[PDB]
Every structure is written in C-alpha cells, then in structure tokens.
Design a protein around this ligand. Structure first.
Ligand code: MET
Ligand code: NA
Ligand code: NA
Length: 496
C-alpha cells in the first residue's frame, strides 16, 4: 500500500485537505450572518468538543483501516462492526465526497477562471462614487460567467470560457491525483501550502492598509472579535458554528479517513491530527477572517457588510471583494492574488475529496491508480453537468451531502468507533504510537459529550429546519441514483 513519504508532507497534505474555500468564502459569510463575534464563542467551543475529537477519531479509523488495505468507510465500518448494515452505512462515506466533489470542483473552476481573467485584465471597468455603480458590473461579471438567469427560470447557461476552465481544472486535479499519494498529493501540497500561506499573508497586510471615510479594516476586525453573549441561546448560531467546524475540518466527508489510511501502521496520529486541525484554524480565523470582512467593513461599514454577506456566500467572494479591490491602486492584480489563493485552497481540498472514490476503486475493486483516477474524473465531470446547467442544484447537493450529511456521518462513525467497536479499544487505537497522548477528559468527550451534542443538533435540525426545505427533485433523484450506484459497486466488491 502507498504511504506518505515524509512527516512534513503528511501534515501539509492534511492541512491542504482542511484549508479550503470554506476558510476564505464560507467562514466569513457564516461569521457575518450570525452576529460576527457572537459566532466565535460557539465556534471555539465546537472546535474543542466536536472538531478535535472527531479529527482524532477519523485519523484513527483511517490508519486502522489502511493497516489492512482499506481506505474507505464501507470496508472500514465492516472491520469495526462485522455487519452488513455497517457496509451500507459505509456507502455514505463514498457518497458524501462524490456529491461534494460534483459542485466543489466546479466552484474551484470559478476561482481559476476568475484568476485568469483578473490576471489578464479582462475585468469590468466601473465608472470612477456610487456603491451600486461599482458593484453592478461585477455582479453581472459573475452572473455571465456562471450563467445566472435574469429571472428565475431554472436553466443555467455557463459561458464557453467557464466550461473550458472547468475541463482544465478537472485536468489539473487529475494530473495531481494520478501521480499517487507521495509523488502526487504530497509533493503538490508541499508547494501549494507555502504558496497559500504567503498569498494569504500578503492579502491580510494589504487589506489592513485599507481606509475609507466609512471605516477601516480594524473596524471589521473589531466586529469579528466583539463578543455577543445574548446569542448563545440561539440554536441557529450553534447549528451554523458546528456546521462550519465540520465543513472547514473535512469531518464527515470521508477525506480524513482516506488520507489517514496512507499513514503507516505505527506512525503518530495524535499530534499530526492536532497540528493539521490547528493549521486549519489559524488559516480560518486569522487569515480567512482578516481579508473579506475587514475590506468589506472598511468600504461600506459594519451595517452594509453584514447585509452584503447575507446576500449570499458567493456575493462576498466573487462580487464584493473584487469590486472593492477595483477601487484601489492595482486592485485587479490584487483580485488575481485573491482568486489564486482561492484556487490553490480549492485544489488542495478537491484532490482530497476525490481520493475516497479513487481509494475504493483501488482497494476493493483492484483497479489501477490510473484507471481509478480517470474513472473518478469521468463520474465527477459527467455528474457536474447537473450543477452547471440546473439552477439551485448546487445548493441542494451542499445541503444533503455537505451539510446534513457530514453531521449525520460524523455521529455515525463516532458511534461505530467508540460505542460498537469499543470505547476502550478506540481509545487505545487513537493514542497508539502518538508522540503525545490525548488528554484524559477527551475520553469522556468522545464517549458522551460529542455524540450527545451531535444527536441534539441533528434532532433540532430535523424538527425545525428540514421540513421547510421539504427541479430540486431532479437533483434529489440523481444523488439517490448515485447512492444506489455506489451500493451496487460495494455489492460487486464483496462478491469479488
Ligand atoms: C473539499 S474538503 C471539504 C471543504 C473544506 N474542508 C473547506 O474548508 O473548504
Ligand atoms: Na477549512
Ligand atoms: Na485545500
């Protein structure tokens, strides 16, 4: 079985798995929509009670399975719980990263295409002192690239350039993935993560220098770090906080498990997972939180920044921030750096979510690495046409697979590992070979606090939020077919 070549490379590949678009696009939106600093008290709490324990649990399950040649949750759930229903529940660990990949690589292609056009200077030229006169050209720029209808008709018409960039992005993902774990993902992570850090630091420094008559970036930093204890009672704040922790840490996507399956049987996983989780949080709260919101607040004020963030997740990243840059010296090249930062973040994360499907085809169906990568590329590329041309299909996939799915699967893996497989056996497997050992209190957090926390979250989410959500049926129909297809592939694997 393949294994990570170096200790540093494993850490940077796991950091590249965690540090993604969610750090710079989803997190600023989630923070601004939920009270700014009010979002930060539950966030930190969730990171301590859910993020860190589930990270260690997914690392342990990955390495345990990889020691037996299984990097995917169907086989791993069966090894932890010899039952056919465990294999069915494992199918979710292939279904989530596939559906997430279908729209995540497409969003990644957006960043690459915007990076290209901004580098070449093919950007709108707003008239040099109206907020709408500056925002509207970039709103049309994004709407033309993805093909947003001027009305609400549910058909999208992406530009030919966007489609070509999507093919190029799929090609780039394949070129990295086809070279394996050590010579592909690891070697590229060693390059992308320093590039990602440097770009983020330069953007943070440049944003800190922004001052307009409406405020400064310091006001955005204040808003982000001003506590609001009156929101701690709101369940919606905790739902967003835990969902953001799940998303940003790649928990419940099956990616951490698959990556950890290439960690050697005796190599450390406690400090490694802790370092990767800490690197992700530094990138998120320090770097991600200091670019979008501070620049937005500096130009528009705290009032309009929150309103723009409420306009959607893409508005802050693809319309507002490029427009704000368009009013500063050289801001087009600054916008290029922003989208290039986003692209490397998306790329290091997209290779991670597509590795589970690759690992299943390699481990269980005995396909070659080339054919596993190429067939995974085919399934993702083909299925992506649904997201490309059917309006609001991307949102439905992110809800079922990337939002409810990850929390349900996180509770599922925790219960299989710490309740069915054995709390003491799981604790021994987590701490085995660790350069440091997990604090004793976390044993009770993993056994009682985390599953009770996640169970209450899911119950609240089901009773209070999902009935309202219940052409979206086309997307539901298709992703159900994807689950049946993976179920059939699991059936073929066990029959072999
Ligand atoms: C594509 S891996 C899941 C998302 C990733 N953790 C992010 O923060 O963007
Ligand atoms: Na992240
Ligand atoms: Na990434």
């Amino acid at each position: 079985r393949e294994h990570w070549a170096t200790r540093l490379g494993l850490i940077l590949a796991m950091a590249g798995n965690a540090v993604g678009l969610g750090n710079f696009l989803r997190f600023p939106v989630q923070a601004a929509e939920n009270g700014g600093g009010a979002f930060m008290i539950p966030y930190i709490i969730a990171f301590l009670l859910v993020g860190i324990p589930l990270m260690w649990i997914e690392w342990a399950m990955g390495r345990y399975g990889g020691a037996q040649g299984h990097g995917t949750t169907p086989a791993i759930f069966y090894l932890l719980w010899r039952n056919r229903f465990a294999k069915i529940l494992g199918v979710f660990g292939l279904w989530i990263p596939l559906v997430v990949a279908i729209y995540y690589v497409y969003i990644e292609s957006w960043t690459l295409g915007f990076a290209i056009k901004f580098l070449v200077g093919l950007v709108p030229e707003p008239p040099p002192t109206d907020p709408d006169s500056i925002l509207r050209p970039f709103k049309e720029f994004l709407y033309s690239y993805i093909g947003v209808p001027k009305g609400d008709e549910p058909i999208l018409k992406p530009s030919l350039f966007a489609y070509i960039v999507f093919l190029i992005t799929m090609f780039i993902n394949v070129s990295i993935l086809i070279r394996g774990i050590s010579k592909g993902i690891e070697r590229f992570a060693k390059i992308a993560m320093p590039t990602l850090f440097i770009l983020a630091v330069f953007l943070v420094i440049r944003v800190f220098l922004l001052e307009t008559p409406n405020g400064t970036a310091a006001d955005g930093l204040n808003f982000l770090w001003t506590p609001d204890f009156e929101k701690l009672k709101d369940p919606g704040v905790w739902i967003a906080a835990v969902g953001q922790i799940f998303f940003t840490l790649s928990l419940g996507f099956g990616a951490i498990i698959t990556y950890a399956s290439y960690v050697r049987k005796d190599q450390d996983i406690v400090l490694s997972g802790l370092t990767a989780a800490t690197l992700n949080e530094k990138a998120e709260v320090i770097l991600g939180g200091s670019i979008s919101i501070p620049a937005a607040v500096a130009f528009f004020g705290v009032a309009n920044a929150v309103a723009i963030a409420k306009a959607g997740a893409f508005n802050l990243g693809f319309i507002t921030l490029p427009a704000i840059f368009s009013q500063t010296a050289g801001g087009t090249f600054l916008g290029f750096l922003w989208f290039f930062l986003l692209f490397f973040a998306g790329l290091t994360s997209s290779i991670a979510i597509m590795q589970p499907m690759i690992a299943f085809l390699e481990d269980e169906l005995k396909l070659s690495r080339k054919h596993a990568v190429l067939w995974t590329a085919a399934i993702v590329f083909f299925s992506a046409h649904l997201v490309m041309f059917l309006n609001k299909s991307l949102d439905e996939m992110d809800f079922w697979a990337g939002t409810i799915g990850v929390v349900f699967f996180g509770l599922t893996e925790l219960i299989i590992f710490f309740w069915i497989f054995g709390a003491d056996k799981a604790w021994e497997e987590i701490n085995r070979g660790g350069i440091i050992k997990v604090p004793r209190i976390y044993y009770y957090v993993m056994r009682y606090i985390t599953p009770a926390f996640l169970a209450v979250l899911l119950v609240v989410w089901a009773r209070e939020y999902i009935p309202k959500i219940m052409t979206v049926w086309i997307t539901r129909f298709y992703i159900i077919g994807l689950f049946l297809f993976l179920t059939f592939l699991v059936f073929l694997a066990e029959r072999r």
